[PDB]
Design a protein around this nucleic acid. Structure first.
Lengths: 198, 122, 130, 200, 113
RNA sequence: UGAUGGCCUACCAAGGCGACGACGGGUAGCCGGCCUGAGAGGGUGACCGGCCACACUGGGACUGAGAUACGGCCCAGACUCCUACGGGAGGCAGCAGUGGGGAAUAUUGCACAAUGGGCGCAAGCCUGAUGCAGCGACGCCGCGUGAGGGAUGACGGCCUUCGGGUUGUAAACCUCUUUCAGCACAGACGAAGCGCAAGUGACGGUAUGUGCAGAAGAAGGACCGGCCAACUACGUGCCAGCAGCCGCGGUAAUACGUAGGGUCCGAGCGUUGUCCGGAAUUACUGGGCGUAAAGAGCUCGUAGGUGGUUUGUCGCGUUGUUCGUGAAAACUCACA
C-alpha cells in the first residue's frame, strides 16, 4: 500500500461499475521455514460492499500486499453475500460465530448510528447499515471476528420467510413495531424512487 | 451451573491486584531518602539510572526513582515521593517530584517544562 | 428422570434437525397443547393422538415446504425446573424481536405474547419458537 | 473563555476554508510548518479530529463549550448529529452572523464582547447566549453610527439570511422565526463522526 | 405547640419562601407536615400562593402563624376567614398583566411591516 | 413501670436457640441519594436532606411534660491548672482561631435588615442559627485580553534541496469602537418587614445604570515511534537520557537532549491517588472443567434440591385489579 497516487501517461486504471466501498482489516506476515531460511508472504482480508447493502468477502494469500489486496477483492467479487434490513436498522437481533468469535447485533432507534468495533464497523458500513447496535466477544482475534460478522448477517431474513413458514401472514410474524419500521423504510425508498424518476 | 448451588454459594471476584502500597493511596507522601546508590537497568536498555530508598511518613520503606538528569536530594532530605511504574528497573515503582519539598527541578529541562520541576523561563 | 417438557422440546429439535418428517411422543396434556398451539400457528404440519402404552401418544408431523426445510427455527424451554419463570402483562417479551411466538401459561389458560398483550394477564411463560 | 490564534494556520492544518475567503490558506493549502508537505500517517482518528477541529475553529467556539454541545445534543430526543448541528447553528453570535451583519465570526465575537447587540430588550455581553425563536433583536446606536459597522450594515452583500432569520427593517431587527433546520442550514462537513467517537 | 412558618429557598441574593406548618422545636428547614403556601419578597408583588382550606383547618385546630407569616395571612385576607371578622376578601396584590409569548412577536411583525 | 412484657422478683416446670448458620472473630452508623455501567451490576454515605448514637473516660442520680441532660450534678480514675500544700478548680466531636497529624482543608469577620427559635400582654430583650462578607482556580459556569485592511510576505529565525520554503496576512504600518477593566456621577430591591413611633439593610454605595480614554491594562500549557493529531534539523552515540506498554541512545534518534516547526488545550495545562466500565476479568443477564484453569480414587445416603400419568379441592407460590402507599429536594419532562 505504497505510492498509490500516480498520474501517468498510460492507458487507464481499471475503473468499472459497482461503485463499491472497499475495506481491508489487517494483514499478518506469514513465515514459511524453508531449510535454513524464512520466506515471508502476506495475508489480506478484503471486505467489499455497497450502500444498498450487499456484501462480499475475499481472502488473498499473496506474498505481495497489492497482490493480496487484489486477490481478496476478486474473491469478494466471487464470494458475495446479501443482507436484508429495515431502513437503517436490523430486522431483528441476531448472534453469529466463527469458532471462537461471537457477534451480537440489534436494531436501534433511527439515526442512532453504527456503534461497532473497528472490524465490525467496516464489515457493517460496507453494507447499507447506518443505525444499528452491535458488539463482539471472544476469539481475541480479528479474522474470526470478521468471519463471524457474515455468520450473524446470514441469519437475517424478511418477515415473508416466517410468514410462509407459519403459513400465517405477518402480525404475529411482523407486528406493528417492525410493521411501521419497514413501512418507513419502504416509504423512504418509494419517495427516493419517485424523486429519481424525474 | 446448578442455580441452586449458586444459591448455596459462589460469585466472588478473583483478586484485587493492588498497585500502590505507600499508604492511604496517597497522591504523594514525604519522607527521608537514603541509599541513593545507582543500580543497573535491564540488559537491552544498557544505561544507569539514579534511584534511592525513601522511608516515607507512611512508615513504609519504598524505592523511588530520581527522574531527569541532575539531582538536588542527598541524605536526610524531605523528599516527596509519588507513585510510578518503571519497567526498566526491578522493584522500582516510585518517583520524587522535582521543584517541590526537597529536590530542585531538573536543570534546564525544556521539552517537558512542567515535569522535572523546570519552572518558567523568565 | 426429572423434566418431561424439556425432553419434549429436545426430541422436537433433534427430529426436525435430523430431517425426520415425524415424531412420536407420550400424550401428557401439557405437550399435547404445546404441539396443538404449534400447529395452530403453523410451525409444524399436524398432530394426531391415538392409543399406546398405558397412556396415549401424540404423533406430530413437521411442516416442510418445497424442500426439506422446517418451519420451526428452534426450540428452548425457558421456565425450566430450578429456574421456573414468571412474567406479567406489560413486559411480555416479543419473540425474535416480535417475529416469533411464545408460550405463556396464563391464569386464564395458555396464551402467546400477542394474545396476552391483547388481553393483559401473566404469570408463567414457556418456550418460544420463531 | 476565548482563544487567541488566527484562522489561517488552522485552515491550512485542517485543510479547509475557515476564514471562508482565506487567500493565504489557498495559497498554502498544506498544513503550516516545515512538514505540511510531509505526508501524515493517515487515520480515521485524524479524520474525526480534523472534523471536530474545523467545527471548533470555524465559529470561534472553543473546546469545553463544544463538548457540552455534544452532550446536550445527545440528551435531545432527536439523533445527536441533528441536534449538535442545530444547536451550533443556534448561537447568539451565529444568529447575528447569518443575518449578514458581521463580516467575520470574530466580528460578532468582539461585538458581543463590547455589547453592541440586544435580544428581546436585554443586553447580553455573553456570546454563549441562547437566542430562542421569535426573539426581538436590535443593534445599539453607538455601534450603529460607527464607521466599520456602518460599512457592514450598509454593504451587507454577505452570505444570505437563512429562512429562520429575518432582518425586517433599517433597525437590523432580526425577527427570528424558527429553528435552523437540517434542510435549511447548509452546514459544512457532517458531525456523525463526532457522535460515534464521543459515544464510545 | 404548632406554628405556621416561612422557610427559605432559592439562591443567595434572591430570597424565596415556602409557607409550611411545623413544630417549633424543629429548624427553619425541617420536615414540613404540609406545604400550605409560598411567597417571595424578591419578586415584584411579593407574590403569595397559599393552600387555603388546609390553612383554615390548621387555624381551626390551633396553628399559630409566625409574625410575618401572620402578616402574610392578613395580606391574603385568610385571617379574615378563620377569624372572619369582616369576611374573607382578596387582600394580596398581583403581578402586572404583562404580554404573552406569541403577542410579542405578533406586535413585532406588525411594527416591521 | 405510662402501659405489655424474667422488666424484676418467690415458686413451679425444662425448656429455647441453631447448619434456612446460633454462639464467636473482625468489620461498619444507616437511608433519600450520589457516581460508573447500555443494562444489570458495581462503589460512596461528601455536601444538601431523614433518623440514631455519642459530648476527658468509666459508674450513679436528679428534675421536669419531657435528660448519653455537649455551654445540669455527684462518685471512681486519668490529665491539667491553682494551692496558705490543708486542699480546691477545670473540659471547643459549637462559632473563630491556636498547637499536633498529615501532601492537603480557610476569619479569633459584619448584622440579627430578611427567616426561624425562647422570654416578655407588649414595647423590646436573647440566637457564632441565620443572612452576609473574608480566605482556596477547591470546583463549575460565563466574559476579555481585541479587531479589520495591510506583501508578493518586509526584519529574522529555522530547515533547506542552497532553488526556495515554516514562521507568514504572520508582520511593520492605516483605520474601528472600546467591552471588561480605570476614572468621575446617581445608585437599591430584598421590607405591604417590624415599631405605633415617625423611624426602620450587615449585606452595600457593591451591583446597578450615567460620560470619559486608547488597542489600548490582561496567556500560557502538554505532546510530536506507534498505539496516538503533531517532523525535520542539530546535539549526546548504550553515555546523557526518554517510555502507560511494545520499547528508542554503541555518531548521523522525527523516540533521547536541543531548536524551530507542527498537534491540541487554555487560565488553565499536565502529573500523582482512587472508583466504575472497557473485562464476558465471577459469565443471573453473560464462562467453563478429554489436550489450555477445572470430575475428589470409588461406592451409599442424611440435609438439600429435585420430579412420571391422571381426578377434584385450596389459590400459599404466581399473575389480574382497587386503594393507602413510597417527605422535599433526588432525577427527568415541561414552564418561568
Amino acid at each position: 500500500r505504497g505510492r498509490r497516487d500516480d498520474r501517468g501517461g498510460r492507458g487507464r486504471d481499471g475503473g468499472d461499475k459497482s461503485n463499491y466501498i472497499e475495506r481491508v482489516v489487517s494483514i499478518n506476515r506469514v513465515s514459511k521455514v524453508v531449510k535454513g531460511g524464512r520466506r515471508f508472504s502476506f495475508t489480506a482480508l478484503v471486505i467489499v460492499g455497497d450502500g444498498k447493502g450487499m456484501v462480499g468477502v475475499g481472502y488473498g494469500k499473496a506474498k505481495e500486499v497489492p497482490a493480496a489486496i487484489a486477490k481478496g477483492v476478486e474473491e469478494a467479487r466471487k464470494n458475495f453475500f446479501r443482507v436484508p434490513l429495515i431502513g437503517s436498522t436490523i430486522t431483528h437481533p441476531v448472534q453469529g460465530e466463527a469458532a471462537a468469535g461471537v457477534v451480537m447485533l440489534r436494531p436501534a432507534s433511527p439515526g442512532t448510528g453504527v456503534i461497532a468495533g473497528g472490524a465490525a464497523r467496516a464489515v457493517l458500513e460496507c453494507a447499507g447499515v447506518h443505525d444499528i447496535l452491535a458488539k463482539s466477544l471472544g476469539s481475541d482475534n480479528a479474522i474470526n471476528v470478521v468471519h463471524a460478522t457474515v455468520a450473524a448477517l446470514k441469519l437475517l431474513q424478511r418477515p415473508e420467510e416466517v410468514a410462509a413458514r407459519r403459513g400465517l401472514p405477518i402480525e404475529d410474524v411482523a407486528p406493528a413495531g417492525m410493521l411501521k419500521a419497514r413501512r418507513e423504510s419502504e416509504a423512504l425508498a418509494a419517495a427516493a424512487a419517485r424523486e429519481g424518476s424525474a | 451451573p446448578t442455580i441452586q448451588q449458586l444459591v448455596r454459594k459462589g460469585r466472588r471476584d478473583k483478586i484485587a491486584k493492588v498497585k500502590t502500597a505507600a499508604l492511604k493511596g496517597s497522591p504523594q507522601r514525604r519522607g527521608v531518602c537514603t541509599r541513593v546508590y545507582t543500580t543497573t537497568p535491564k540488559k537491552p536498555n544498557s544505561a544507569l539510572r539514579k534511584v534511592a530508598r525513601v522511608k516515607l511518613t507512611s512508615q513504609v520503606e519504598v524505592t523511588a526513582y530520581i527522574p531527569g538528569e541532575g539531582h538536588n536530594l542527598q541524605e536526610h532530605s524531605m523528599v516527596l515521593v509519588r507513585g510510578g511504574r518503571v519497567k526498566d528497573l526491578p522493584g522500582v515503582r516510585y518517583k520524587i517530584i522535582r521543584g517541590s519539598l526537597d529536590t530542585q527541578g531538573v536543570k534546564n529541562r525544556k521539552q517537558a517544562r512542567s515535569r522535572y520541576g523546570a519552572k518558567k523561563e523568565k | 428422570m426429572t423434566d418431561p417438557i424439556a425432553d419434549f422440546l429436545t426430541r422436537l429439535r433433534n427430529a426436525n434437525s435430523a430431517y425426520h418428517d415425524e415424531v412420536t411422543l407420550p400424550h401428557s396434556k401439557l405437550k399435547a397443547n404445546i404441539a396443538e398451539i404449534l400447529k395452530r400457528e403453523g410451525y409444524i404440519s399436524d398432530y394426531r393422538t391415538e392409543d399406546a402404552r398405558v397412556g396415549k401418544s401424540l404423533v406430530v408431523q413437521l411442516k416442510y415446504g418445497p424442500s426439506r426445510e422446517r418451519s420451526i427455527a428452534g426450540l428452548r424451554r425457558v421456565s425450566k425446573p430450578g429456574l421456573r419463570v414468571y412474567a406479567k402483562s406489560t413486559n411480555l417479551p416479543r419473540v425474535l424481536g416480535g417475529l416469533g411466538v411464545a408460550i405463556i401459561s396464563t391464569s386464564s389458560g395458555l396464551l402467546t405474547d400477542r394474545q396476552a398483550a391483547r388481553q393483559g394477564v401473566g404469570g408463567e411463560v414457556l418456550a418460544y419458537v420463531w | 473563555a476565548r482563544y487567541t490564534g488566527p484562522a489561517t494556520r488552522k485552515s491550512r492544518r485542517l485543510g479547509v476554508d475557515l476564514v471562508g475567503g482565506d487567500q493565504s490558506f489557498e495559497k498554502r493549502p498544506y498544513p503550516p510548518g516545515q512538514h505540511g508537505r510531509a505526508r501524515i500517517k493517515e487515520s480515521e482518528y485524524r479524520q474525526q479530529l480534523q472534523e471536530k477541529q474545523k467545527a471548533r475553529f470555524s465559529y470561534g467556539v472553543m473546546e469545553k463549550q463544544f463538548r457540552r454541545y455534544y452532550e446536550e445534543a445527545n440528551r435531545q430526543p432527536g439523533k445527536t448529529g441533528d441536534n449538535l448541528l442545530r444547536i451550533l447553528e443556534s448561537r447568539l453570535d451565529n444568529v447575528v452572523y447569518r443575518a449578514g451583519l458581521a463580516r467575520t465570526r470574530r466580528m460578532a465575537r468582539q461585538l458581543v464582547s463590547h455589547g453592541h447587540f440586544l435580544v428581546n430588550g436585554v443586553k447580553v455581553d455573553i456570546p454563549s447566549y441562547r437566542v430562542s425563536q421569535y426573539d426581538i433583536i436590535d443593534v445599539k446606536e453607538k455601534s450603529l453610527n460607527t464607521l466599520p459597522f456602518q460599512i457592514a450594515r450598509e454593504t451587507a452583500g454577505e452570505r444570505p439570511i437563512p429562512s429562520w432569520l429575518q432582518v425586517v427593517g433599517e433597525r437590523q431587527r432580526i425577527l427570528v422565526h424558527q429553528l435552523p433546520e437540517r434542510a435549511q442550514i447548509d452546514v459544512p462537513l457532517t458531525e456523525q463522526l463526532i457522535v460515534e467517537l464521543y459515544s464510545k | 405547640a404548632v406554628k405556621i412558618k416561612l422557610t427559605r429557598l432559592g439562591k443567595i441574593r434572591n430570597p424565596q419562601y415556602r409557607i409550611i406548618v411545623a413544630d417549633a422545636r424543629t429548624r427553619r428547614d425541617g420536615r414540613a407536615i404540609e406545604v400550605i403556601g409560598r411567597y417571595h419578597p424578591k419578586e415584584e408583588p411579593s407574590l403569595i400562593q397559599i393552600d387555603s382550606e388546609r390553612a383554615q383547618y390548621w387555624l381551626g385546630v390551633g396553628a399559630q402563624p409566625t409574625e410575618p407569616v401572620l402578616a402574610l395571612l392578613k395580606i391574603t385576607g385568610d385571617w379574615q376567614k378563620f377569624k372572619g371578622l369582616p369576611g374573607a376578601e382578596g387582600t394580596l396584590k398581583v403581578k402586572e398583566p404583562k404580554p404573552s409569548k406569541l403577542d410579542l412577536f405578533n406586535a413585532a411583525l406588525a411594527e416591521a411591516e
